[PDB]
Amino acid sequence: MLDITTITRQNVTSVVGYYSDAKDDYYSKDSSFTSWQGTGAEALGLSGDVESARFKELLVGEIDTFTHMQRHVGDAKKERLGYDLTFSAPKGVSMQALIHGDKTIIEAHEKAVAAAVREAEKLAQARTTRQGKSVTQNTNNLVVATFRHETSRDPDLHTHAFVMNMTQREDGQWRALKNDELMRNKMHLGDVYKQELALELTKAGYELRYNSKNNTFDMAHFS
Numbered sequence: 001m002l003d004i005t006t007i008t009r010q011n012v013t014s015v016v017g018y019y020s021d022a023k024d025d026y027y028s029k030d031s032s033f034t035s036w037q038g039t040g041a042e043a044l045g046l047s048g049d050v051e052s053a054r055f056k057e058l059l060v061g062e063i064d065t066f067t068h069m070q071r072h073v074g075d076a077k078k079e080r081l082g083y084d085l086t087f088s089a090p091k092g093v094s095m096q097a098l099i100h101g102d103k104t105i106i107e108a109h110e111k112a113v114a115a116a117v118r119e120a121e122k123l124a125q126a127r128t129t130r131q132g133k134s135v136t137q138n139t140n141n142l143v144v145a146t147f148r149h150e151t152s153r154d155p156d157l158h159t160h161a162f163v164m165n166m167t168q169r170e171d172g173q174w175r176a177l178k179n180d181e182l183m184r185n186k187m188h189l190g191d192v193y194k195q196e197l198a199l200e201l202t203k204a205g206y207e208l209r210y211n212s213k214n215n216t217f218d219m220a221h222f223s
């Protein structure tokens with residue numbers, strides 16, 4: 001449902017969107033496979049398809065050519081670059097989307113990810129210094145690059161919602177995410193995705209089967 005991978009300098013080459021084709025500015029232009037999300041992304045003037053060069057700049061804290069974030073206070077290879085929140089659809093749902101080509105499923109999946117992303121924003125914090133003392137500021141803004149993967153084979157519909165390690169403070173300064181609230185809310189975020197997906201599917205008219213034991217769902221008549 002939800003997996004959270006912490007990306008650092010040690011595992012960066014495994015992050016979604018790290019590689020791209022030289023000829024292309026975008027990974028997939030004129031489609032919904034990628035998109036910028038979050039209030040931080042909008043504050044940066046970012047929306048629609050994700051430009052690979054920009055994604056990679058933000059990955060390593062490059063707000064712009066004159067503005068590189070300092071997030072390293074300790075071993076430099078330990079610096080967190082971001083968090084991959086991977087939202088995976090139930091198996092029957094993936095089958096309906098990928099094996100039956102049901103575009104409605106894709107849309108509901110996207111809505112559910114957007115909803116979970118918005119909930120994630122509530123948990124965004126940054127350290128600051130009021131008057132000599134340190135205080136945690138609720139910033140309510142994230143920069144997120146999302147990449148949808150449609151793996152036809154054992155069907156697996158999921159989206160990588162990559163949360164940059166940054167948030168915009170009240171003073172306009174970009175600082176590292178204080179990830180504590182995010183990390184202890186992994187289960188909550190996963191349930192938000194699950195609930196919104198069920199809600200959207202139900203609204204479209206789909207019959208869903210509920211598993212009381214572990215409080216999950218999947219398409220009625222399907223894995």
Ligand SMILES: [Mn+3]
Binds near residue numbers: 149
């Ligand atoms: Mn993937």
